């Protein structure tokens, strides 16, 4: 977000930044071997 006013003189500014990041990873491996 950004906001401005400008106009004797007056200047006003507001800024905001937000970031959220998520990484989730899962790996599953299974081996069953039987010989008889």
């Amino acid at each position: 977000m950004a906001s401005k006013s400008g106009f004797i003189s007056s200047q006003s500014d507001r800024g905001k930044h937000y970031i959220r990041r998520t990484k989730r990873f899962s790996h599953t491996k299974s081996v069953f071997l039987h010989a008889r």
């Binding site: 950004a2 401005k4 006013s5 400008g6 106009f7």
Partner: protein, 47 residues
């Protein structure tokens, strides 16, 4: 001694194979992206 005796027959060997392969593979990507912007500017004509 069982129930019967062999009156006649044949001798030799027997061989058998059953063999079975089953592969399944799945790969799946689902990607969504929304990008939005709104911005505005105003002033009489001074401001």
């Amino acid at each position: 001694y069982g129930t019967h005796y062999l009156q006649s027959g044949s001798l030799g060997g027997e061989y058998r194979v059953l063999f079975y392969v089953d592969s399944e593979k799945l790969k799946q990507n689902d990607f969504n992206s929304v990008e939005e912007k709104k911005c505005k500017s105003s002033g009489w004509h001074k401001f």
